[PDB]
Design brief:
4 copies of one chain form a homotetramer. Chain A is of the alpha+beta class. Chain A folds into 3 domains: about 120 residues, Acyl-CoA dehydrogenase/oxidase, N-terminal domain (Butyryl-Coa Dehydrogenase, subunit A, domain 1, Orthogonal Bundle), CATH 1.10.540.10; about 120 residues, Butyryl-CoA Dehydrogenase, subunit A, domain 2; about 160 residues, Up-down Bundle (Butyryl-CoA Dehydrogenase, subunit A, domain 3). Helices cover about 55% and strands about 15% of the residues of chain A. Chain A is built from 12 helices and 9 strands. In chain A, the strands form 3 sheets. A 4-stranded antiparallel beta sheet of chain A has the order 2-3-7-6, with no helix packed on it. In chain A, strand 8 and strand 9 form a beta hairpin. At the A-B interface, strand 8, helix 11 and helix 12 of A face strand 8, helix 11 and helix 12 of B. The structure holds flavin-adenine dinucleotide (FAD) (4 copies). One flavin-adenine dinucleotide sits at the interface of chains B and A. Chains A, C: Keywords: Acetylation, FAD, Fatty acid metabolism, Flavoprotein, Lipid metabolism, Membrane, Mitochondrion, Oxidoreductase, Peroxisome, Phosphoprotein. Chains A, C: It is an enzyme of class 1 (oxidoreductase).
Amino acid sequence: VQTRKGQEVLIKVKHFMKQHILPAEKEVTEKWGKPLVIDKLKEMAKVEGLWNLFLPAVSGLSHVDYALIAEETGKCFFAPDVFNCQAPDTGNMEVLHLYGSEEQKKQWLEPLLQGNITSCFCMTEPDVASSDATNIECSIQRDEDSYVINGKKWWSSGAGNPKCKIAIVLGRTQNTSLSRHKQHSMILVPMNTPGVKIIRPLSVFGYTDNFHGGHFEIHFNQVRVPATNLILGEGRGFEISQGRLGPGRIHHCMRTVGLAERALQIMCERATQRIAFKKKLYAHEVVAHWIAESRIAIEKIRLLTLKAAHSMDTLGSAGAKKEIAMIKVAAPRAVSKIVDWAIQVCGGAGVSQDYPLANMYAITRVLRLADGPDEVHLSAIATMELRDQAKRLT
Amino acid sequence: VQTRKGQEVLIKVKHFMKQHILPAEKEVTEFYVQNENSVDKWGKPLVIDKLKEMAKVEGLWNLFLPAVSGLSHVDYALIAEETGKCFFAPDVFNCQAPDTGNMEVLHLYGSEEQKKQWLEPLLQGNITSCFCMTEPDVASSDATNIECSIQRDEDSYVINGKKWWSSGAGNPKCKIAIVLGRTQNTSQHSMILVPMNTPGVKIIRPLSVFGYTDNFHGGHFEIHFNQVRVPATNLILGEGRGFEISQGRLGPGRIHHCMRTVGLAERALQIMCERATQRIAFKKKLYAHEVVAHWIAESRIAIEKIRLLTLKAAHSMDTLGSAGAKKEIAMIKVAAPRAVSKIVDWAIQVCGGAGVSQDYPLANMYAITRVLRLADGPDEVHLSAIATMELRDQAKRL
Amino acid sequence: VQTRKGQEVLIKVKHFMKQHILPAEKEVTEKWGKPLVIDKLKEMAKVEGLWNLFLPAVSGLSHVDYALIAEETGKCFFAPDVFNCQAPDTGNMEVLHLYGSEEQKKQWLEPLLQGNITSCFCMTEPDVASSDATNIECSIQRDEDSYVINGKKWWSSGAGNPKCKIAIVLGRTQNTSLSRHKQHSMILVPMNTPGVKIIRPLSVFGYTDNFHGGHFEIHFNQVRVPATNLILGEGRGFEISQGRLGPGRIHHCMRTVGLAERALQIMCERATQRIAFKKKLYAHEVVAHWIAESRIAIEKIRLLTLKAAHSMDTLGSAGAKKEIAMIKVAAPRAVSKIVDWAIQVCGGAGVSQDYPLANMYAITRVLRLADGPDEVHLSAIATMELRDQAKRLT
Amino acid sequence: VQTRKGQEVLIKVKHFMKQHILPAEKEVTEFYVQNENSVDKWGKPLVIDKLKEMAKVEGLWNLFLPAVSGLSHVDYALIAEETGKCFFAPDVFNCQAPDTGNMEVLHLYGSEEQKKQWLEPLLQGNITSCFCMTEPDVASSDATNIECSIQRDEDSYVINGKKWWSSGAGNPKCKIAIVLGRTQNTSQHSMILVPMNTPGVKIIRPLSVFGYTDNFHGGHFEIHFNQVRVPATNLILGEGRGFEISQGRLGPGRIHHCMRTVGLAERALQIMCERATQRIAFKKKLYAHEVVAHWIAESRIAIEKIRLLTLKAAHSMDTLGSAGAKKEIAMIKVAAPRAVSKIVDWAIQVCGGAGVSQDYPLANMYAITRVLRLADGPDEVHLSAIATMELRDQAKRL
Ligand SMILES: Cc1cc2nc3c(=O)[nH]c(=O)nc-3n(CC(O)[C@H](O)[C@H](O)COP(=O)(O)OP(=O)(O)OC[C@H]3O[C@@H](n4cnc5c(N)ncnc54)[C@H](O)[C@@H]3O)c2cc1C
Ligand SMILES: Cc1cc2nc3c(=O)[nH]c(=O)nc-3n(CC(O)[C@H](O)[C@H](O)COP(=O)(O)OP(=O)(O)OC[C@H]3O[C@@H](n4cnc5c(N)ncnc54)[C@H](O)[C@@H]3O)c2cc1C
Ligand SMILES: Cc1cc2nc3c(=O)[nH]c(=O)nc-3n(CC(O)[C@H](O)[C@H](O)COP(=O)(O)OP(=O)(O)OC[C@H]3O[C@@H](n4cnc5c(N)ncnc54)[C@H](O)[C@@H]3O)c2cc1C
Ligand SMILES: Cc1cc2nc3c(=O)[nH]c(=O)nc-3n(CC(O)[C@H](O)[C@H](O)COP(=O)(O)OP(=O)(O)OC[C@H]3O[C@@H](n4cnc5c(N)ncnc54)[C@H](O)[C@@H]3O)c2cc1C
């Protein structure tokens, strides 16, 4: 099931969580960068080797092994960072790991693995429906030695971070000899390149997410980068984005299971601390049944997350397409519902700064959109099902 | 069936909304945006004042109060629906919460002195008020849990307790508080007027809703009551009458929120359809993706259902009073917030990432509806009351 | 609101229900025709004038007036018949009333109004998706004096009834000079015409519905009818079906409100007669909340039914298109849910012959399909909404 | 992780299903159809017998019982899923309810004489049995309500009471009943073997499920117990042990139903996709209407969820026993029937009018799943148990 290394590392992560991270929550909870405790915590994690756990080729962990670890990190908003496991940097690391040239890795992959710099992924554009990636019009043109980039991007997570020195950008390479689906490319763009302008931060229900901060509109005004900044090859844009978003999708879902287990904990502590109409709240059967329904949902999605991870292990993330889609739909909406019941049990306190539930709700709502909206994944599953259904009849 | 006056005033409100209020939205929003989460800005820009004055001149003012407006509850429901389409519209006609409820409490139960002193300034929009019932340390959905102490020595009352979620306390104009506390007796609760500048009243901190502080109506505060002494004549109606008065005020409170919510929904669906026609994904406009189409249709169905149920309730209040319409108010209080919540959430989804952003009012709209499943009584509590009432009526008929 | 006549007639229907119909339920409940009591009951209704109430031009009732009456009939499975208000005969009467020639009315409309014969509507075909009416391929061809009909029809309700002497049939009149949407016609076909063959009955969850009996596959094998049997004109098929199904749709929904009010009654009687875990069942809060949710749903749909009726009164059934669609979607699924909770409260008894809930569930499930499936109505509403939404911006 | 034997036997079952069982479905159905609602036909056509014999020869028999099959619960779950795709498949491998539960009750608690007399013939498929717990006159979901009287005079027991929903009683082979009654004592319930031919046992009437009588497994009966006398040695295990034994049997009962339901669902989704490709409406195949597409996708998601949760539960039973897996069995008992119910209902909708007709197995499939939200314990009861267990585990960890 789990590997022996996987079991040991999980045990180590749990200890670290209980003994260092969680005791630091109060303070960290109570400007687009991170307080010094985050740094001391990172250093400690490095020493005990709890670092880059998300990357098999470095961690020596299977995706099954990591799922249980990632679940644990999901119980705390700054946990993934401490182990260098946070988005959008994990996906960006994977992109370079799988497709980067040797020069590209020496320059960017190494610093990222070290936690020296951060990065942002730039795909979504305000002026076009970006859920259909073929709509992307951010222009990339080629003169002999270099590429010129022009366009608008938004929702770039993490751009506010002064350490964010590098951007991975998806654009159109208009080419008349290639087909409609081979019209896009991925290119490295250093944040300090002339013509790169960060315009404004974007809120999520009036959170700005300063801590991971944040989410930005970035314009690309005549930016020139060396041809050697292109990733893999011209026309390979969609391929690379599929390569990175597969893990991206699954890491978010693993974390969500931990999020949910935290919500249900908060829900039960609360339902026992409050007397209304001469009964503790858990004695009102409707509240009881929310607790129960939440337990059922968590088990279902943890299992479906594990199934997906196990597919990746044995098929690679392309071959696990269907299972990743399934968990990407299931997880955020189920956990969203759990958080919302938890908020309801907490009364007015549920929407307040006094609990982490309102934040938790914002995170889960957004995951029905980020890394691809539910509806898009559902259509992909329907297509895939109808193919498999056709196969079994041949 | 609407009244003739009701029809005329509705027409007037529509012609004010289109011609004055809505064209001011762009600017008022730019003000709301810059001041959200401000430590110190809890009031309104001058346009709100100019707008209020204009409304006074045309008589569009205090429309929510029959004994002043000469309007039925049915008449107002349609009007309030229209105000719901803009976050500052109810204020312009002096129809905003928590002030409408507080005014009604004084109108029905206030002594002549109490009215002359507080009801009058509120009716002019000179001051504002806040209602103080909810307490952090006890489950306040069961009102009998309220422990905020009220004790009596001859000429006065002494008040000690904690209150929170007091809406509007941050606005400097908020000079008066209506408070619910325990008056221990044999053989438990009272409502009392407390001026905000009374020694011992301390405003502790603002409270956020998904990280919105609601500065514009601002906002929602924890208030402590530390040995505050008020005149015995500040008591409303009588000792032991707390629950009665809160029922008296929250009935309309509940229904006014629902009426506004119908307008909120209609606005979401408009935003949803404009958007669904402006975006091409996978070689179609988004409304051509049948799943989106069916959210539009499901929305229309839900609005019609809840508008009618709002009207049914209003019509009950007209012919039964708000005590006799208990059941119908409960029904709409449950139905409306959750339905419109769902409509807003689909509208957000249709808008993509923009739907949670500051570029649309949907994220705010969602927060408002979410909070209405809690404020003025949580769904679960109203459901239980309906079940009890249903089983009584069910017993009656057999 | 209601008219004075409407109020009086409702009062009369309630009395009749309580005093004659309902006391007969036991027996009628405890072969495709009806027992003699049904006949004696019909005769009594005629004498007191409680007959054809569904038809304004005869009853002098508004659609609002009838909605409340139809609601009352919905509380008993044989009630609509007693007042001559049952489908498919009401729709068939309306079709002749609005579009029949004088000869056609003298021959068919009169007997039906009298309750002497019954009729069936034949639109749905097994071999094509009949929810898109343009798919209908049942052939209608013309030689000089007469029409020849060839095709298959199924789900013809009431065909088993020995009194069913007449069929209203929707077929294709292939005509090269008309457009795709003008290719269909409606034609009267007497059941005893050579070439008309009733093939087999169809069950609904293994009910055959003998009482209204039933639902049949009918084949049309070279049937010849006089040209004067055509309704209104060649090419007008869709128009006539819209003309008849509008009321059809709304009458079914009115009846459903009464059905629901019966289910909730059964649910509450039961929830008070049963002690489980030391409490009556209504004291288990989850059961309480089903009762409450059911009350809420009934009020919503009764109101939406009334809104629809009131539109018909003031706009005609074409102009009320949108409101009829809205209630057609809302009603059957909501009431379906109420019946299903009622079944759950009744335990094993809920699915049994000992209650009318299992039948009630079958009726409501089927109304999500008959007179047009939910999905089709939802699409129509979306189209209409987007038009109205466009209007308000001009 | 499956065992090697488990893998081999699964392969065999698949190769029997495709080659013998499924090709017999057409005919067996024609038999089911003609005999549904028959007053007097409660047994099975001869092909079922030939099929049973063939299975015996290849060893595909009693697969549900580890101590005989040598299979783990995980191993069987996959097998039972396969049986679920055909209404007569579990019988062919002697894996049908209520007989599997009754066999387990004797296997775990039966005395040597009891086994030799009843367990043996059942294991051969010579006789059948029925379980008698539910009583019409009391809410039987709370087992302590059972009033069916059992009294003791020296050498024997006297039984008086009403029972209903006794599945299979109509089949002539049903020679034995396992009965739960009250043994009044201080300081309440017992299980007792009752042969069907005992004087005083009267089968009253069959019960329908949406007007299906279930003749094939036939069927479900009300049985009265009018002064029936049995030997004291007919008691199972001991006086006072009723609840224990019912828990002992219903644990597997619950889980076997769920495993079969996964196969039921997979069959619905297959029917749904074949249909959605065979019908053109509004110029598209039905799967091209995005709403239908999303029901297909939602179905796939639900199946994977419940299969995994079934496997999790099975794996618990393997490592904890069925008492120690209480929680996980409860979870799957709630989750499975309602999810698959929804899948079947969407499949019906996709099929149009045909979906409620005798031309498809969907209407039957719906009835089966609906009944599983009641049988072996209603959802609501299992939900409450989960809540209680969750709050205990939640207390443990803190
Ligand atoms: C907190 C947050 C962080 C983000 N971080 C990043 C980032 O780091 N990098 C980045 O490139 N982007 C990022 N995004 C944005 C993002 O991923 C997109 O918003 C998402 O992919 C949808 O793009 P869109 O806003 O253009 O929606 P649109 O393309 O305009 O579509 C909007 C809605 O249409 C519907 N829809 C689309 N197609 C179909 C269909 N076939 N059938 C039925 N319905 C359909 C969906 O409901 C969809 O949400 C982030 C977004 C949020 C909220
Ligand atoms: C934006 C906002 C503005 C507000 N403004 C005001 C104001 O102006 N004045 C004021 O006095 N208060 C105000 N409040 C707060 C308020 O009304 C309460 O939060 C709410 O009514 C319940 O109080 P509580 O937090 O104590 O919930 P609790 O009483 O602790 O109960 C918590 C949860 O238990 C559940 N529950 C309770 N009883 C039952 C039952 N019998 N059966 C099943 N479930 C049950 C409910 O789901 C409930 O939400 C405001 C709140 C918000 C969010
Ligand atoms: C109890 C009962 C009585 C009946 N009585 C009559 C009668 O008296 N006369 C008569 O002519 N018919 C009658 N019918 C049948 C009937 O009305 C049809 O079955 C219904 O119109 C659908 O036709 P169909 O069976 O061909 O479904 P299909 O056309 O093959 O379509 C099946 C399913 O496709 C889906 N669908 C269709 N279009 C869309 C879309 N645009 N988008 C998304 N989903 C879509 C729906 O879910 C639909 O149900 C009766 C049916 C029942 C169950
Ligand atoms: C097809 C079929 C086959 C069957 N076969 C058998 C058999 O072979 N042997 C046998 O002994 N029985 C059998 N039964 C019947 C059976 O199991 C019962 O019907 C069921 O377990 C409950 O019994 P009841 O009808 O008395 O429901 P009740 O006990 O009267 O309770 C009714 C409803 O109340 C609700 N409820 C109960 N407790 C609570 C609570 N604490 N909180 C909230 N809600 C609550 C539930 O929703 C429940 O369904 C069969 C039933 C069917 C439909």
